[PDB]
């Protein structure tokens, strides 16, 4: 009877482990029974509790394949099935109240951000993300990394690159599993190269060179080169060739964001070092891009803050700064201040540890 | 998929359409609370109107969303103040948890309010709508015929 | 519930004591410098 309760539970976990294509024959047919299994004498008990005996991951694996819409087949106004999942996951979400829930709770948020990333709208993300903070000391190294990956994706549409760079770089330094070195690793790399492109600071893909397929690399190089050399012409023809690629990965958003960046990168390489830079040169470069908006674009260029310049067109010179800092006041001290904060948090962990 | 059909009717003109919108929203508030959280000032303006009579329903919807935010105390006021939207007589995750909080609120207060005045419970000092929910908790307890619970909450 | 009160009590004694550890620790810092100086 003690044994009976326990025996049901061990059986429920066991059925969940088996069904990743062993003694199985249709993940979707079986879903009904998996929902059935989950909720009595398991999901029910845990009301103020969280564990790694309850795991969204097992159910995630199951649910993910159905969302290729090949079992739905787009015969229908909306999926029922995803709505059901979402209803049920949100039902857990209530139960969590940030007292001991950070564990399983965090997976549900990964799932929720994924559905927005497939085809929803990513403005709803903001609250979940905030709710979802509370000291994290029970989430696994792979889980941290996936969450960051999804979070980074959110940030990028919202036009927040720096924040996304920090998270993706922090992600790849979790996960000693050899199972997240496989295709997942490739996806992660993709996103780190995209963020590098957006900032437009972009280094060469050297590091990536012995950790991706040479097939992946060459197109990936092609994009980076397009930005770096600073041609619109080069960039457009690279988009044209590797159309299937940018579509496939779903990082088609680049084509909007990057175009304005590419043209700016192209002025930047042309030097702005001395007290005046003659107007004719800068006009010449721009003339190739567009010669009806040479004043409008240079003005916009300055406004952005990427580069900064002064123009007289009653002298017809463009006046510029070095683009090199000074050390004589608070701004290097602010870097000193960030570093000491980082050290203290780290110190607190070593002592605790 | 979207709460957007519903939310559109919540801002549309005529009282009737807004009454329908409240009840349309109502059914699925819990799942979609995130989106509906932005529309809270609008919902709150119905509540404050004492000419519009589905004020209570707008309040109820506000409470669910505040709960999901972390503002448990705020929603507890708002359900009482609606004047029917506090019902313990149903059994829910919403209801159980905000009742847990309500007792906590009265007990904390009850420490302070005894020290000033030892007749407070006897009186309007802690408002009747709160005192009723607490008094019903006592009755709930007594029915289960395990006295240590009833006496506990009251002590 | 008579049990819950009791358990809350046990925990409370414990709390006063967790602050108490800290207060002896602060004190020891002062005495450590003075001793090292003395030598």
């Amino acid at each position: 009877k003690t044994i009976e309760v326990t025996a049901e539970i061990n059986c429920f976990m066991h059925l969940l482990v088996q069904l990743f294509l062993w003694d199985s024959k249709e993940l979707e047919q079986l879903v009904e029974f998996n929902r059935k299994v989950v909720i009595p004498n398991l999901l029910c008990y845990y009301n103020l509790r969280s564990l790694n005996l309850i795991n969204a991951k097992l159910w995630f694996y199951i649910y993910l394949s159905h969302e290729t819409l090949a079992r739905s087949s787009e015969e229908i106004n909306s999926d029922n099935q995803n709505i059901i999942l979402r209803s049920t996951m949100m039902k857990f979400l209530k139960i969590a109240s940030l007292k001991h829930d950070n564990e399983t709770k965090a997976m549900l948020i990964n799932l929720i951000l994924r559905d927005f990333l497939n085809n929803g709208e990513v403005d709803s993300a903001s609250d979940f993300i905030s709710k979802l903070e509370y000291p994290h000391t029970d989430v696994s190294s792979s889980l941290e990394a996936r969450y960051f990956f999804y979070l980074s994706k959110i940030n990028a549409i919202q036009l927040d690159y720096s924040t996304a760079n920090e998270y993706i770089i922090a992600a790849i330094r979790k996960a000693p599993h050899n199972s997240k070195s496989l295709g997942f690793l490739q996806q992660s790399n993709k996103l780190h190269c995209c963020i590098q492109l957006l900032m437009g600071d972009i280094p060469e893909l050297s590091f990536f060179h012995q950790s991706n397929m040479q097939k992946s690399l060459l197109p990936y190089y092609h994009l980076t080169k397009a930005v770096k050399l600073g041609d619109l012409k080069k960039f457009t023809s690279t988009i044209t060739k590797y159309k299937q690629l940018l579509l496939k990965d779903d990082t088609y958003q680049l084509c909007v964001r990057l175009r304005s960046n590419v043209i700016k990168t192209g002025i930047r390489i042309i030097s702005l070092t001395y007290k005046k830079i003659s107007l004719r040169d800068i006009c010449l470069k721009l003339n190739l891009d567009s010669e009806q908006t040479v004043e409008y674009m240079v003005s916009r260029a300055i406004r952005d803050g990427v580069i900064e310049a002064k123009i007289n067109h009653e002298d017809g010179f463009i006046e510029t700064t070095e683009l090199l800092n000074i050390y004589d006041s608070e701004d290097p001290q602010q870097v000193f201040d960030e570093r000491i904060k980082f050290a203290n948090q780290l110190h607190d962990e070593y002592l605790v540890s | 998929t979207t709460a957007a059909p519903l939310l559109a009717l919540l801002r549309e003109n005529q009282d009737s359409v807004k009454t329908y919108a409240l009840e349309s929203i109502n059914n699925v508030v819990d799942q979609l609370w995130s989106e509906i959280s932005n529309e809270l000032p609008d919902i709150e303006a119905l509540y404050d109107d004492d000419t519009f009579s589905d004020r209570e329903m707008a309040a109820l919807i506000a409470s669910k969303v505040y709960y999901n935010l972390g503002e448990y105390e705020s929603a507890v006021k708002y359900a009482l103040a609606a004047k029917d939207r506090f019902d313990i007589d149903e059994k829910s995750q919403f209801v159980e948890t905000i009742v847990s909080k309500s007792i906590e609120m009265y007990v904390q207060e009850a420490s302070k309010q005894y020290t000033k005045d030892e007749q407070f419970y006897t009186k309007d000092i802690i408002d009747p709508k709160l005192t009723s929910i607490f008094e019903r908790m006592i009755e709930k307890c007594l029915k289960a015929s395990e006295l240590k619970l009833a006496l506990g909450i009251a002590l | 519930y008579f049990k819950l009160k009791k358990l809350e009590k046990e925990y409370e004694l414990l709390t006063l004591q967790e602050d108490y550890i800290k207060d002896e620790q602060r004190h020891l810092k002062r005495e450590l410098k003075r001793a090292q100086e003395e030598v």
Binding site: - | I103 | Y1, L4, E18, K22, Q25, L28
Partner: peptide, 28 residues
């Protein structure tokens, strides 16, 4: 009742961090 369980739980969490400090206090 549920709320009373939660108050106790948070005390249990704080203690472990103290235990690691009970060790540090002894070294001083």
């Amino acid at each position: 009742e549920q709320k009373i369980q939660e108050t106790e739980l948070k005390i249990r969490s704080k203690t472990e961090n103290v235990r690691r400090l009970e060790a540090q206090r002894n070294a001083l």
